[PDB]
Every structure is written in C-alpha cells, then in structure tokens.
Design a protein around this nucleic acid. Sequence first.
DNA 1: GGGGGTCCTATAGAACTTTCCCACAC
DNA 2: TGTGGGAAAGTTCTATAGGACCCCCG
Length: 103
Amino acid sequence: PRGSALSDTERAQLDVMKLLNVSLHEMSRKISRSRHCIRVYLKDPVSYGTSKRAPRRKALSVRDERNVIRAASNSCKTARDIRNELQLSASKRTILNVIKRSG
DNA sequence: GGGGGTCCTATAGAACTTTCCCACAC
DNA sequence: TGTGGGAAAGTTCTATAGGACCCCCG
C-alpha cells in the first residue's frame, strides 16, 4: 500500500482514542495517518492485517520439480546439467533449491 | 473551521528467484 | 573454468494506505 501498515502502538493509540470518542479527523491528526486507514482498522480491528495476498508463481511446474528430483535421485549430475537436460529455463540455483527441499 | 463519506492507484511486504560471493575441485 | 551453499538483491504478487474528491453543520 501507499503507506506502511499500522503498527501495534499506532493500533493501541487508535484503540484508546476510540474509547475516548475522538473524531476521525482528530484521530488521524494525532497519529499522522489517513482517515481511510483508521476507519477500516476501527470498523474491524481483530481482522486488521488478516487477509493474505496470493504470492507470485514458482519458477518451475510440479512436473519440472518432479523431473528435477528424479534426475538427482538417480545420478550425481550437477544442477547445471539437470537444467540443460530438461531444458529448464530456471536458474541453476533454483534447481538446487528444489533438490534441497526434497530432503 | 468542524464533522462525515466513497473510490482510484501506487506500493509494502511477502513469497520466490536470481545474482553474487565463497572455499574448494577438477 | 567449474561446483554447491550462504547472503544479498531482484522479481512478482495484491490488499490496502494515501489522499483525491464528495457531502453537511455552525
């Protein structure tokens, strides 16, 4: 987002100001934070920061991963070898990461 | 000035990857 | 020249902070 997430202290401050029935304009003045942001925190504090964001995609498909492992499970070929063998177009390092993730 | 609202959009911050080192190995 | 691995920098993700743009009251 355009700004950082409300921290613990700024949420605690929001909290007590709410119990003191401070206006929103005034609240956003004292913590130098947009009203937009505060309004949403107070409407439902328990779920602030709660909604995950779908991540970027891995560089390798489940197939490619499975082939990479099969190649390394069998023989001592280098990561680079495997990458060229399955014409993989993912970094030599990524392959190693996959191999290492398989125990 | 005080108070309130709705909606566009650039980005935080995370997930994942790649680059860049390193001590070593041929 | 290469390796694999640790660290740091890059890429790629989308929910959300900012703030634009509305309103009314004294």
